Amino acid sequence: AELTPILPFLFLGNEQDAQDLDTMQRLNIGYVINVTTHLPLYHYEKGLFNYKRLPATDSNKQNLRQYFEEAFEFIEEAHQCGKGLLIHCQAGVSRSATIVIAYLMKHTRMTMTDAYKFVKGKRPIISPNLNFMGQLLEFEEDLNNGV
Numbered sequence: 001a002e003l004t005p006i007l008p009f010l011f012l013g014n015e016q017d018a019q020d021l022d023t024m025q026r027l028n029i030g031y032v033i034n035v036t037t038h039l040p041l042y043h044y045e046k047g048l049f050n051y052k053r054l055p056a057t058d059s060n061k062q063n064l065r066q067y068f069e070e071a072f073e074f075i076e077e078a079h080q081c082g083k084g085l086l087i088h089c090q091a092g093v094s095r096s097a098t099i100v101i102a103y104l105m106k107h108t109r110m111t112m113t114d115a116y117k118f119v120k121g122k123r124p125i126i127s128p129n130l131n132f133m134g135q136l137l138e139f140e141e142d143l144n145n146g147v
C-alpha cells in the first residue's frame with residue numbers, strides 16, 4: 001500500500017493507505033481530510049495531524065459541491081505552512097478524487113478533462129461516478145463565468 005502524490009504536498013489514498021503512519025510522517029503530512037461518514041479518523045488519539053471530515057456517501061445523489069470551499073480552505077492552510085495534506089475515502093477513491101480534481105481546476109486553472117487525465121495518470125484505479133462528474137462539470141462552468 002502506497003500514498004499517491006498528486007502534487008508534492010497533496011496526497012490521495014484509501015482506507016488502507018491512510019493507516020500507514022510511518023509513511024505519512026516520512027512525507028511530512030500534517031493535515032488529513034476524511035471524505036466519509038463512517039471511517040474513523042485514523043491516528044486521532046496520537047495527536048499528530050489536523051483532521052477535517054467531509055460527511056459523504058458514495059451514492060448517485062450525494063452532494064460534494066457543498067464541501068469544495070470548506071476543503072479548499074483546509075488545503076490552503078497546509079500549503080501555507082509547508083505541510084502536506086492527505087485526502088482519502090475508500091477503495092474506489094471516487095469521493096476523494098472528486099475533491100482533488102476540483103482543487104486542480106480552481107487553483108491550477110486546469111480544465112476538467114486535463115485535471116482528470118492528470119490524476120488518473122498517477123492513481124490509475126478510480127471508480128466512476130456520474131453524479132460527481134456532473135458536479136465537476138457544473139463547477140467548471142461556474143469557474144469560467146465567475147462563481
Ligand SMILES: CCCc1csc2c1-c1nc(SCC(=O)C(C)(C)C)ncc1CC2
Nearest residue numbers: 094097098113116126127128129132133136
Ligand atoms: C471527472 C472527469 C472524468 C471524465 C471526463 S471525460 C471522460 C471521463 C472518464 N471518467 C472516468 S472515472 C472519473 C470520476 O468519475 C471521478 C469524479 C471519481 C474522478 N472513466 C472514464 C472516462 C472516459 C471519458
